[PDB]
Design a protein around this ligand. Structure first.
Ligand SMILES: *[C@@H]1O[C@H](CO)[C@@H](O[C@@H]2O[C@H](CO)[C@@H](O)[C@H](O)[C@H]2NC(C)=O)[C@H](O)[C@H]1NC(C)=O
Ligand SMILES: *[C@@H]1O[C@H](CO)[C@@H](O)[C@H](O)[C@H]1NC(C)=O
Ligand SMILES: *[C@@H]1O[C@H](CO)[C@@H](O)[C@H](O)[C@H]1NC(C)=O
Ligand SMILES: *[C@@H]1O[C@H](CO)[C@@H](O)[C@H](O)[C@H]1NC(C)=O
Lengths: 97, 49, 49, 142
């Protein structure tokens, strides 16, 4: 019984030294959190219908009244990108709990 | 399992220059997104275990 | 451009290249002489910045 | 360079600290862009060197307190920060938080979670009262 336990604990070390994907449940959670943050950073490249994605260029090129209509379009879509991220993370937090 | 940020300080000199090209974590932090560290360190989880 | 004696005809409209210079758009836009001064991706106030 | 400024290159306005870059721009390139489509390097239009753009230092501020009926004394965590950035914030110019009496220092502690000010670091361990992060907790004690 002792030699069989000692040999079965040997096979855990050999497998964890040999196979790649066995911790796929833990790597999938790290990958989902990283992919959700990369998706959130990438939504800053979106115009949401404004003349530019770049908030400084709207302010470099347009006056106070023209810029407000363009900035509202970026606020609307970036605020929607955060509400989507936080809802998806609230739904994932329940799976982890 | 390889982590993407543990939360353990970014001090600008480790994130400016070459790293400001070749790292996603600096593009996240320069856009207002931050990882927070866990309360128990991995060394405290190992003491419990 | 603006004060030259003879303009081109609209079927054979002329194009001049504007390069390696300081433009002043207050000097143009503040003039009372223009019936139309209408812009499509920049406010005429911002052209100097 | 190495200083937080309102830059304007060719009409590209922004706020950041400028560093000399080793990025290899081709002759037709004036700017470099991030994955967020923001400019993160520029070629100076006077002397043709490449400047990395990095935003002026920032982070969360967490305030650590007992109850207001226990004390008005608070500690402050500047989270994700090395201690050096809180003195360098010296309020001869502006900040988002206007208050700066903490940045007097004398009881600063570097944690992995950030720069903690207004709490005494003690060597003897206790059960966690207020959680700070990375094994550190705070408590109000004699
Ligand atoms: C906080 O920042 C300072 C630098 O401003 C770091 O000090 C350096 O630490 C390394 C490793 O010990 C040494 O090689 C350098 O010579 C140190 N520089 C100076 C000027 O002392 C410090 O390690 C940082 N601390 C944390 C926890 O981030
Ligand atoms: C700006 O001045 C420097 C030094 O005289 C010169 O090398 C550079 O070519 C100038 N910029 C332009 C647009 O010529
Ligand atoms: C808070 O402290 C005050 C005394 O300063 C006391 O009257 C009150 O009952 C306390 N309340 C609680 C919930 O601790
Ligand atoms: C903690 O203990 C060490 C000796 O083990 C001592 O050198 C150090 O100064 C102590 N730190 C504090 C905050 O008292």
């Amino acid at each position: 019984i002792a030699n069989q336990f000692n040999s079965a604990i040997g096979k855990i070390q050999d497998s964890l030294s040999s196979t790649a994907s066995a911790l796929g449940k833990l790597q999938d959670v790290v990958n989902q959190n990283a992919q959700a943050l990369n998706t959130l950073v990438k939504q800053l490249s979106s115009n949401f219908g404004a003349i530019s994605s770049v908030l400084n260029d709207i302010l470099s090129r347009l006056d106070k009244v023209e810029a407000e209509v363009q900035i509202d379009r970026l606020i609307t879509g970036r605020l929607q990108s955060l509400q989507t991220y936080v809802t998806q993370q609230l739904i994932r937090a329940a799976e982890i709990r | 399992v390889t982590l993407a940020d543990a939360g353990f300080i970014k001090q600008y000199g480790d994130c400016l220059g070459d790293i400001a090209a070749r790292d996603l974590i600096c593009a996240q932090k320069f856009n207002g997104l931050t990882v927070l560290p866990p309360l128990l360190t991995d060394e405290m989880i190992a003491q419990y275990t | 451009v603006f004060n030259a004696t003879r303009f081109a005809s609209v079927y054979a409209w002329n194009r001049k290249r504007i390069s390696n210079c300081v433009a002043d758009y207050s000097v143009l836009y503040n003039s009372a002489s223009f019936s139309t001064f209408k812009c499509y991706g920049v406010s005429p106030t911002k052209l100097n910045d | 360079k190495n200083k937080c400024v309102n830059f304007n290159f060719n009409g590209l306005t922004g706020t950041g600290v400028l560093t000399e870059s080793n990025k290899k721009f081709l002759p037709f390139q004036q700017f470099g862009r991030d994955i967020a489509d923001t400019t993160d390097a520029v070629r100076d239009p006077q002397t043709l060197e490449i400047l990395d753009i990095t935003p002026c230092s920032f982070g969360g501020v967490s305030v650590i307190t007992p109850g207001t009926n226990t004390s008005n004394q608070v500690a402050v965590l500047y989270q994700g920060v090395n201690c050096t950035e809180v003195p360098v914030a010296i309020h001869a110019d502006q900040l988002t938080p206007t208050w700066r009496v903490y940045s007097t220092g004398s009881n600063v502690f570097q944690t992995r979670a950030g720069c903690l000010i207004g709490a005494e670091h003690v060597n003897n361990s206790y059960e966690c009262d207020i959680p700070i992060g990375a094994g550190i907790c705070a408590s109000y004690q004699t």
